[PDB]
């Protein structure tokens, strides 16, 4: 039945059955039918009179424009109501800035999308949440509204009821918006809806099939390319089958690896099996991508490479485990279900081979994805000539058994190839880097003052204390002589240093870090986006900030000549740089001068200035040398990878010069005190919060990583790396130097860096104390704290330190072991994506420098194989591959000795047998050429 309440509210019974672990549970929840559900339209003049405020006393905003996109009659002005299917298929088109401006998303739709896809639902909610003056999405709770709520008719499927529910919403919207002359358009691909309208017994409704609706828009030609779309693969199993298979030990799930060297062979990592199960064949891979979580079924033993009942399959499984131990034959399997696709928006370019210039109508073409481990996709398009030489974004729709290739439809036009705009943009979004400007909800969390924000003159002022009651805990260090040593064009300053000599002979060192925590608060959208990005990526081209410009370049940035809030760490240490005591405190400072690394070094060098500031700068340098020396004695590592800096001519936007950044003594000055700051903070926050302390560890490198390096060293150069301890590894790496070539030591260092374990963030409750060890720094504990503006990890550390000293209680989100695990796993992924995008940015610009230039540069052989060699050019910092065919003449006469890593061959321009060992300095002609298949600017090198 249905009961009417006092508020005009109704209530009914929503009952459904959910199957869990082979169980049947009857779930019953009560369903309240309201009468105060807003249409959320600017035109409406009735709803604002019946609307009520939210828990936070805030009435919802009517956002749907009073003058939407006007279309040719009889559509006129109109709102768009979406179906469940059109959302799941064309979410990319729903995010396109050039279409779908005013859209109504029914509750029943939002619910179905949430259950069918988690991710798409989030993207749809973001469109609703993120609405501006360009795009406007709402959620009309039709199930909760008594006016629109429909109930299942006798003998009616749930799919037809839901379609009738959406159709009822459109009718309600249509009748409700009649006085405002705004029609509603139902975008749906469903067959069922039309029959109910063809009769048109009760009311009229304008419905267009997704494709049919697009053909009614002014910009139909610009958005038609975004419309989602004996050979036969074996059908995937039904869902019930795989769930029972996993439970009965018949089927097994894991992540599949597909190498670019072989697309016809995959391997899955299974917990029950020691060695990864191979998957041989194209039917056996079954339309699986690299990184996909797949469910595999073990093939018969006769299918093994170098059954009926479930009992025999478990016996086959045991025989498979035995065969893996014997290492004679290795078990194979076939994927029969795809648990979780690794699919994401994909960047590629149209293949000129599959597009006919003579064709004027719609034609099928192929797009070559930038991922070399991925197949090509079929695309339906009419603008095949306009997308010919451009980086395009495409999204897959389906890959069925009866099609040799996956089918995809275009999403966006990034730009032309080898252009700074298109290549940088493609570079970022391929490494999952959000570069879009901060939304309005984000920018609203910023101070109301704006750029004219200022730290209070008096820290006891009634007004200032009234607004900030924590200001009394704020220390005053504006009398100190603070200076910042950062690169030339650095506007986002994180760290600031000072030094005084205490009357007791000891030194007072203070490291001051930007007080980002004071501006970004947990829960806000600003903090949300900050955590999402994890870190700001650094390119030669641009600079994608983690926080808004107003905050990171000014308010938080420790700029000179201005009063800025900061989290300060002050030490009292002797002349031998030994810490006597350490204090943490939130303070307010004023930077005396923002030096550059070259500018700071010259000031010290001159002897020109006796000023109290410069005298302090010299003192800091003296401490740093002592501090660095202690670390080296302790067992600190000294790895190296000084990447090149793409010089840009003032005269020409295009890059022409590639130089190298030199490490000045001021770089060692800043580095030593930043490390000192991070260490002291790490010790303090862990002492205060032993279970949720944001820390950073570095695993010790396995012996297997250096066994190959020591193999090449002991064979060719007759040397070795100890690996017994970090100090032992450092000492042996240090003596690893050739007198005939000084760069040999640098080459070994930059090569022994590749075999180091990746450092990761974590929380102190996830590991034990001995696991806090940082191998590369030889410290028992460590954390990131000095760069709040460009690292969210520091922000967490700042909040934890503030709670550690008693300045302000630590937020619950930083004391939840579960929430901390999510933060760490995110910033770890964002960190990797940051460096990879950064290195890719260097790769593009350097590749553009050598675009139309050939020069004999110095090269070093780092990898020796039978198919060719790999040489590294330190001048450009680019590794190149010289194939055997282009390496020498007569490939059948060349020989490769794995024992000596020697490759003997007869050069093309000669006839004398030359033996090319490893680590050899060779002359190499550089040349760049974009591959016609991968569209990636590679550097073809020819030795001499």
């Amino acid at each position: 039945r249905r009961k009417r309440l006092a508020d005009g509210l109704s209530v009914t019974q929503k009952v459904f059955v959910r199957s869990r672990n082979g169980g049947a549970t009857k779930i019953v929840r009560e369903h309240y039918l309201r009468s105060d559900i807003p249409c959320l339209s600017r035109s409406c003049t009735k709803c604002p009179q019946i609307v009520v405020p939210d828990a936070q006393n805030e009435l919802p905003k009517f956002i749907l424009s009073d003058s939407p996109l006007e279309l040719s009659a009889p559509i006129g002005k109109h709102y768009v109501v979406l179906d469940t299917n059109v959302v799941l298929q064309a979410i990319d088109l729903l995010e396109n800035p050039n279409c779908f401006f005013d859209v109504i998303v029914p509750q029943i739709v939002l619910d179905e999308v949430r259950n069918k896809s988690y991710p798409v639902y989030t993207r749809l909610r973001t469109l609703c949440r993120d609405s501006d003056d360009h795009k406007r999405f709402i959620v009309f709770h039709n199930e909760f509204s008594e006016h629109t709520f429909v109930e299942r008719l006798p003998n009616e499927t749930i799919n037809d009821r839901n379609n009738r529910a959406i159709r009822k919403t459109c009718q309600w919207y249509s009748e409700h918006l009649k006085p405002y002359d705004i029609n509603v358009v139902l975008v749906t691909n469903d067959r069922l809806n039309r029959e109910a309208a063809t009769k048109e017994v009760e009311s009229n409704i304008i419905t267009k099939s997704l494709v049919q609706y697009i053909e009614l828009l002014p910009n139909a030609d610009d958005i038609r390319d975004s419309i989602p779309q004996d050979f036969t693969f074996p059908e995937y199993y039904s869902t019930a089958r795989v769930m029972g298979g996993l439970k009965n030990g018949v089927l097994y799930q894991g992540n599949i690896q597909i190498s670019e060297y072989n697309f016809l062979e995959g391997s899955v990592s299974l917990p029950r099996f020691s060695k990864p199960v191979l998957i041989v064949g194209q039917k056996n891979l079954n339309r699986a991508f690299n990184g996909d979580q797949v469910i595999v079924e073990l093939l018969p033993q006769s299918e093994w490479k170098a059954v009926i009942s479930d009992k025999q399959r478990r016996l086959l499984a045991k025989d498979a485990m035995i065969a893996q131990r014997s290492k004679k034959i290795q078990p194979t399997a076939k994927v029969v279900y795809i648990q979780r696709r690794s699919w994401r928006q994909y960047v590629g370019q149209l293949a000129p081979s599959s597009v006919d210039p003579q064709s004027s109508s719609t034609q099928n073409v192929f797009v070559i994805l930038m991922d070399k481990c991925l197949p090509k996709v079929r695309i339906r398009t009419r603008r095949a000539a306009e997308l010919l030489d451009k980086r395009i974004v495409i999204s897959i729709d389906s890959w069925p058994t009866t099609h040799k290739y996956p089918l995809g439809h275009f999403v966006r036009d990034l730009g032309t190839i080898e252009s700074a705009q298109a290549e940088t943009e493609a570079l970022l979004l391929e490494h999952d880097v959000e570069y879009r400007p901060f939304s309005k909800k984000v920018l609203e969390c910023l101070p109301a003052e704006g750029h004219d924000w200022k730290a209070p003159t008096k820290l006891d002022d009634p007004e200032a204390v009234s607004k900030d009651p924590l200001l009394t805990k704020r220390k005053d260090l504006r009398d100190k002589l603070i200076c910042s040593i950062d690169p030339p064009g650095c506007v986002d300053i994180n760290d600031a240093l000072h030094a005084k000599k205490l009357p007791n002979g000891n030194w007072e060192v203070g490291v001051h870090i930007a007080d980002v925590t004071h501006f970004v608060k947990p829960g806000t959208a600003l903090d949300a986006e900050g955590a999402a990005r994890g870190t700001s990526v650094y390119l030669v081209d641009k600079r994608i900030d983690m926080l808004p410009m107003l905050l990171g370049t000014d308010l938080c940035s420790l700029k000179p000549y201005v009063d800025r809030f900061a989290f300060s760490v002050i030490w009292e240490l002797d002349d031998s740089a030994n810490i006597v005591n350490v204090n943490f405190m939130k303070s307010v400072i004023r930077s005396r001068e923002a030096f550059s690394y070259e500018q700071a070094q010259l000031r010290i060098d001159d002897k020109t200035q006796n000023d109290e500031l410069t005298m302090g700068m010299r003192a800091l340098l003296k401490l740093s040398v002592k501090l660095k020396q202690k670390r080296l004695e302790a067992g600190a590592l000294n790895l190296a990878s000084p990447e090149v800096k793409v010089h840009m001519d003032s005269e020409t936007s295009d890059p022409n010069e590639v130089e190298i950044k030199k490490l000045l003594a001021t770089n060692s000055l800043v580095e030593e005190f930043m490390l000192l700051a991070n260490i002291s903070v790490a010790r303090k926050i862990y002492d205060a919060f032993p279970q949720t302390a944001m820390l950073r560890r570095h695993a010790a490198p396995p012996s297997t990583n250096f066994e190959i390096l020591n193999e090449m060293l002991n064979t060719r150069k007759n040397m070795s790396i100890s690996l017994e301890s970090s100090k032992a590894l450092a000492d042996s790496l240090d003596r690893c130097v050739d007198p005939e070539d000084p760069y040999f030591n640098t080459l070994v260092r930059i090569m022994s860096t590749r075999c180091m374990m990746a450092a990761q963030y974590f929380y102190s409750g996830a590991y034990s104390y001995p696991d806090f060890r940082h191998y590369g720094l030889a410290v028992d504990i460590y954390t990131h704290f000095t760069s709040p503006i460009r690292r969210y990890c520091d922000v967490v550390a700042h909040r934890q330190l503030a709670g550690a000293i008693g300045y302000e209680p630590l937020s619950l989100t930083h004391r939840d072991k579960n929430k901390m695990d999510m933060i760490c796993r995110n910033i770890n992924r964002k960190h990797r994506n940051a460096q990879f995008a950064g290195r890719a940015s260097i790769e593009y610009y350097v590749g553009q420098v050598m675009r139309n230039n050939e020069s004999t540069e110095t090269g070093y052989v780092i990898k020796v194989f039978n198919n060719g060699i790999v040489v590294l050019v330190p001048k450009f910092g680019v590794e190149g591959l010289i194939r055997l065919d282009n390496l020498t003449e007569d490939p059948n006469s060349a020989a490769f000795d794995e024992v000596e890593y020697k490759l003997t061959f007869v050069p093309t321009n000669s006839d004398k047998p030359r033996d090319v060992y490893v680590f050899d300095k060779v002359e190499v002609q550089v040349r760049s050429v974009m591959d016609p298949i991968t569209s990636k600017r590679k550097a073809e090198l020819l030795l001499k």
Binding site: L246, G249, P271, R272, R314
Partner: protein, 49 residues
């Protein structure tokens, strides 16, 4: 125990990481065959009060 009982390890998933519970072998007693209990007959005492 059965030579090769089909029942092997049972996979249990955590929050991201995976683990496998060790295969439990079902021990079965013989319907007929039996061995006598090895009692230290030198130690068997009898009660009196």
């Amino acid at each position: 125990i059965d030579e090769r009982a089909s029942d092997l390890r049972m996979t249990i998933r955590t929050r991201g990481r995976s683990a496998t519970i060790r295969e439990t072998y079902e021990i079965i007693c013989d319907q007929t065959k039996s061995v006598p209990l090895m009692i230290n007959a030198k130690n068997i005492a009898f009660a009196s009060n």
